[PDB]
Design an enzyme around this catalytic site. Sequence first.
Site, PDB file in Angstrom:
ATOM      1  CD  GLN A 112       9.286   4.279  25.524  1.00 11.34           C
ATOM      2  OE1 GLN A 112       8.253   4.806  25.122  1.00 11.34           O
ATOM      3  NE2 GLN A 112       9.384   2.978  25.698  1.00 11.34           N
TER       4      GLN A 112
ATOM      5  CG  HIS B 268       7.217  10.160  22.537  1.00  8.44           C
ATOM      6  ND1 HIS B 268       7.590   8.903  22.121  1.00  8.44           N
ATOM      7  CD2 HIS B 268       6.382   9.983  23.586  1.00  8.44           C
ATOM      8  CE1 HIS B 268       7.012   8.000  22.890  1.00  8.44           C
ATOM      9  NE2 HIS B 268       6.259   8.628  23.775  1.00  8.44           N
TER      10      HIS B 268
ATOM     11  CD  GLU C  15       2.449   7.353  25.789  1.00  8.95           C
ATOM     12  OE1 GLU C  15       3.249   7.559  24.821  1.00  8.95           O
ATOM     13  OE2 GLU C  15       2.468   6.315  26.536  1.00  8.95           O
TER      14      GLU C  15
ATOM     15  CG  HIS D 104       7.925   9.934  29.118  1.00  8.87           C
ATOM     16  ND1 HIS D 104       8.138  10.721  27.996  1.00  8.87           N
ATOM     17  CD2 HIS D 104       7.309   8.814  28.686  1.00  8.87           C
ATOM     18  CE1 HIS D 104       7.648  10.108  26.935  1.00  8.87           C
ATOM     19  NE2 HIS D 104       7.149   8.949  27.328  1.00  8.87           N
TER      20      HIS D 104
ATOM     21  NE  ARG E   3      13.449   1.047  23.106  1.00  6.10           N
ATOM     22  CZ  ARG E   3      13.366   0.692  21.821  1.00  6.10           C
ATOM     23  NH1 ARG E   3      14.410   0.797  21.008  1.00  6.10           N
ATOM     24  NH2 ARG E   3      12.229   0.191  21.355  1.00  6.10           N
TER      25      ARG E   3
END
Length: 381
Positions: A93, A95, A124, A245, A264
């Site tokens: 993933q 972001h 995150e 990550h 993704r």
Amino acid sequence: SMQKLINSVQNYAWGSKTALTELYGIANPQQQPMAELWMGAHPKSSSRITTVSLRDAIEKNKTAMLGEAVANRFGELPFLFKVLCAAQPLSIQVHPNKRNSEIGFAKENAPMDRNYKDPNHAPELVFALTPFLAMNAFREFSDIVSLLQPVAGAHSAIAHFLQVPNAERLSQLFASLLNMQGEEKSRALAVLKAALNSQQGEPWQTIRVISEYYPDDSGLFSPLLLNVVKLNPGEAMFLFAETPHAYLQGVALEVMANSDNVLRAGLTPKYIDIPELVANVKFEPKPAGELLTAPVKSGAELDFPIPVDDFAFSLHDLALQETSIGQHSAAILFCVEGEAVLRKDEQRLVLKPGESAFIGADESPVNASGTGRLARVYNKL
Ligand SMILES: [Zn+2]
């Protein structure tokens, strides 16, 4: 004053059947996969207090519950706090940043639940509760080269990279790998999966761990591109924007801003818009020793600095003598191990491991004592 939380468990197919029971005694007699335990006030599954929605208790009084800086900056609880139990490797993933999530949400609107469900950015932090295996960010160009040489005949793009190990080639290579089709792809896996047999250690062992769940996926190549890490219990990492990550194995605490956005990058059957992915990725290596977050210990509080305003995260060592825990915001206190006695005036609240408490802004500070440790999510503004 202090409200013990009733929390939602997401039973995604990838979750452990035993880890939440084994750690925290959380009941599961029909043995569902238990993937995420949610602590917060998500619109789809708010934690509850004694019963009413925590999300509703917040909107009924923002200032008192969040504190004025949080309610004036965010207008809601600005994070979601999870225990994550990965019994399978999950997808890679990325972001996108703030700018590009805005553009992305807006652009999609001209289909729905889509990769931009939401125009928010998605910082995150992950915190290892058990040995936690993961991928985070591109390795150093020179290590990418060494790891690719055993599989260099896998694909033309790998050869092209090795000849000139730069950011363009890595980018081309990344894209090229995800867009492998049919026998292009098979020649590639064969070079890789046959060559798992004549290589030792990491990152090959990790690949082998993934191939059980993803035999026919180009993300089996990613541990050659991306830093593989095994976080020990109590170590943590921040997941920056534009940085591939994946969470591959183990149990962790995860704090995030409220965004459901995600591009993704593999270890997934879903369609991947590679142009979209590639524009939202930073092809710069990141050295092994910058991956973990260096915490700062003051008193019994071990703070993990977050370069983003949306949340903060600290561990608190409990002693039999009471300590004060306070913040200028709402906080969630989560018992990691041992047992915590929380006290505010006449009120006592016991937390056993895996139990959480919501402390509103107008109820800070509280006194904590006991054994083990308590994790706290809050805001430093
Ligand atoms: Zn993530």
